[PDB]
């Protein structure tokens, strides 16, 4: 045997322990501490290619949501040059990166994760806050527990993906080799997670990939916080570059180079077309075929049967619905209840509503979600409350105030609607407003087709129902209405290695991050046949 | 549990090889009126088509027809209508259809399916074995398995709650879209998707009709209900045109031309704003593969080893070897013992004489494109027709293996992907060997197939580090040719496709969309947190 393939390992990990904040408590002092090293702060974010801090003239500056006269980080947009010398420099270090053990790549997310888990924990948690307007607990499980988990649970698939290996008969021996993908990885992330942005580039980086990331401009401050973690734990220069820039710009560039081999995007549907309209444009110039990944929003459901919990259906709708002022891809914006059962829930769901405060994150622990993200997002959910306000199908039931004059301030809103098919049950506002339609209890079938076919997107989505075969049924209708299917809890919070995230239709490609097969997207496979013995003839026996 | 089908002898005196010589006379003389079907339905279009048996073309081994848009669009509706309950059924009971098929193919049908393979597409028997029986019935088999075992990759449930992932199928439809070349391919194509859950329009290879239409009235023997393999033979670009105007695409499995793959990609991307979900790719689209030689190799492996890759079924493989490359040094045995061999090769009609190595290519237009490469060789100032060459057209469409000498190592012929008996040599100072090695790398679009042949363990590690890429099927002192199932995944990145690995544990996924399911068994309580208070 001229080739030896040594053993492979395995690895433990468990989901990282949510904390609880308790007055009093290290966690929460450290918190505290975080968020007063950051009032009255601004970072000042370079580009970084390799080891290099590059800054251009196309000076931005990110805006502390709930109070949007602090600029938490002024940063640049790579232009196409430096893009282009990233992509160069990037290239350059991804066969050395690539020919790294598995195990290697491994460690340096390990590393990470630790960092994050411990002393950087209250760091990442208050720039999440001040940065992207989170709260204690909204901060604490994307910063803290989802990346740390993306990063163990990753870590631990790949490095027990090696194992994963073909049969041998004599005179032959056959071994997969997990190559990273030749070329370049653009990773595009979004404001509403600091974790998702971490995974973006994170994932194809364990994989032996070079990746030049993109990080959202509204999550600029924590995104490079996550960045300059990685390259403390060991990540090598060149192997990410941290290139914030103009989306357009950013896409026309990846887009028109031919070493470019994958996209992992999470973001809007219309973008994500154009990237990949933009990569089918270009095929001709590309070395292969590039890998798409994205994951698109969606607009989700809450379907309550007669037989609910009605104290499960109002608190864990309003979770899902407002959490984070309901920006997330996950978050329910339709509610269907029962006539039977409106009564009681109307009631119970305008009393709670009452209660909920909104407010600053970082002076009042109080606050149960803050402001949203930016002035683009609190334009669209003003025209969509003008829009309930007009529509004689839709009736405000509570809340509708709006104010921007400290920072982009919107109550949780709920809405009623008579008519299943109004605009405002198909399209996503990506803010705090719930519209419910509530239907008759003998039409429950009817109602969830409805719910199936209303909307063009297949992302999340909870049925509440103490009966088992409604359960069963409601199960089967709704197969594909739901990537993430919910029974008797919040269509929201999935945890990385117990609900693998993602959905079809609109939603995107699927691809399941925080489940063991994502990061199969991020390697093309080579297999490795020795063979032992000479081959003897070229002729058969049977031709004799 | 399963393991790969056993290749038969073929003795004589044999079962297998008095089954197949009774198989095959049961096809002398015999046109087949192949229909298109949709759901049970036996279609015929005025669009009459024939397939050929390519080494005696006057035969007419099939008569079919190719469906039109509408009769593709019906298809497309009536399968629509079958998938959700053949989605619902548990993966077991699925691959409990493509187990059954396995058996029928290995047992009973084994003789048919090579026959029709070896009468229709031109294969010899032991290129029909490996194919038709062999690969297929272990692509059954061991997807079987692989999807089995994949309902038990489950996630973490911690109280109170309970995580369940449901491998669904696609929503939509997928398109398959399989090659003349192999028997096996189509049934995978076809047959991976279905076995998840998809239903599937399958487009099978004019050329292929006979075998392919074997394969699919033995799914349905085998219990695979109506409507979710729809057989429709079509005009290509129709076809394309087609299932990538229906909103309800969501896949793609091809194999075949890079051209094509391009084309059909292009076509979905026009079409983005139509489609429920974004449909997935898959393509497999050839290669130019090498045979790298070291001063240090086996002689004698290198020449049966190259001798088989590039002339086995007239080099129509995307995996036949078809640059060589050979020291200075070794160049004298290599040379001597490849044309002394080549002059032994016999070539003829596989079901008539079994002593005959390879017969005529596959149609044609495989023989019109075949003899321009000819023309090529003998043209080019750097190239150099050694041994080979003669062509025949008359009866079937009988090429000789040809073996050229090239002084350029660049030149269009090391490049480009002939898909005949045609193999190029390039001989290199030993000196040079580093030299060359990036030549291998860096000459052309393709990441398929390679093999080095050496002794040296220091060659081999060095070679291999530097070829990581430039095969993704990668051989050490064995031919470019022969993936098992299950013991060498197929496939490679560059021009070569998209890599999804068929034969492999994970090529199942691209035709699952998964859906987890979180229930949780207590009351959910208050919406505000501890620390808030």
Not at 151 to 167: C, D, S, T, W, Y
């Amino acid at each position: 045997h001229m080739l030896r393939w040594k053993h492979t390992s395995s690895l433990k990990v468990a989901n990282e322990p949510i904390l609880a904040f308790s007055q009093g408590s290290p966690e929460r002092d450290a918190l505290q501490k975080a968020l007063k090293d950051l009032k009255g702060q601004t970072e000042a974010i370079p580009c970084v290619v390799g080891d290099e801090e590059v800054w251009t003239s196309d000076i931005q500056y990110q805006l502390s949501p709930f109070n949007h006269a602090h600029k938490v980080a002024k940063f640049c947009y790579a232009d196409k040059a430096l893009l282009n010398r990233a992509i160069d420099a990037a290239l350059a270090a991804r066969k050395e990166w690539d020919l790294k053990p598995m195990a290697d790549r491994a460690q340096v997310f390990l590393k990470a994760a630790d960092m994050l888990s411990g002393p950087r924990r209250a760091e990442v948690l208050a720039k999440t806050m001040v940065g992207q307007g989170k709260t204690v607990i909204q901060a604490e499980i994307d910063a803290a527990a989802e990346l740390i988990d993306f990063f163990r649970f990753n870590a631990k698939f790949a490095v027990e993906l090696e194992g994963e290996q073909p049969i041998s008969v004599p005179p032959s021996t056959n071994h997969t080799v997990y190559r990273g993908l030749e070329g370049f990885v653009a990773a595009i992330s979004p404001f509403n997670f600091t974790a998702i942005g971490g995974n973006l580039a994170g994932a194809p980086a364990l994989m032996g990939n070079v990746v030049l990331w993109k990080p959202s401009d509204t999550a600029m401050l924590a995104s490079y916080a996550v960045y300059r973690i990685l390259r403390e734990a060991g990540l090598p220069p060149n192997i990410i570059q941290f290139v914030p820039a103009d989306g357009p710009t950013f896409g026309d560039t990846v887009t028109s180079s031919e070493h470019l081999c994958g996209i992992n995007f999470t973001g809007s549907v219309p973008t994500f077309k154009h990237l990949w309209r933009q990569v089918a444009q270009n095929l001709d110039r590309f070395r292969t075929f590039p890998r798409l990944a994205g994951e698109c929003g969606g607009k989700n459901f809450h379907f309550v049967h007669s037989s609910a919990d009605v104290d499960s259906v109002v608190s864990g709708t309003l979770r899902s619905a407002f959490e984070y002022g309901g920006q997330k891809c996950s978050a329910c914006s339709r509610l269907y209840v029962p006539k039977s059962l409106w009564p009681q829930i109307k009631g119970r769901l305008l009393e709670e509503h009452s209660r909920i405060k909104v407010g600053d994150p970082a002076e009042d622990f109080g606050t149960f979600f803050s402001a949203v993200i930016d002035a683009k997002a609190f334009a669209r959910i003003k025209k969509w409350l003008e829009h309930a306000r007009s529509s004689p199908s839709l009736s405000i039931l509570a809340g509708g105030q709006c104010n921007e004059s400290v920072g982009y301030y919107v109550e949780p809103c709920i809405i009623e609607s008579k008519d299943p098919q109004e605009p405002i049950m198909k399209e996503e506002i990506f803010g705090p407003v719930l519209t419910v339609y509530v239907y008759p209890d003998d039409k429950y079938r009817e109602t969830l087709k409805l719910v199936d076919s209303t909307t063009s997107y297949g992302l999340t989505g909870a049925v509440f129902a103490q009966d088992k075969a409604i359960v069963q049924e409601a199960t089967r209708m709704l197969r594909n209405a739901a990537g993430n299917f919910y029974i008797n809890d919040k269509s929201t919070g999935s945890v990385v290695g117990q609900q693998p995230f993602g959905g079809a239709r609109a939603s995107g490609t699927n691809d399941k991050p925080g489940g063991p097969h994502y990061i199969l997207r991020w390697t093309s496979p080579q297999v490795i046949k020795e063979t032992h013995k000479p081959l003897g003839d070229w002729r058969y026996s049977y031709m004799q």
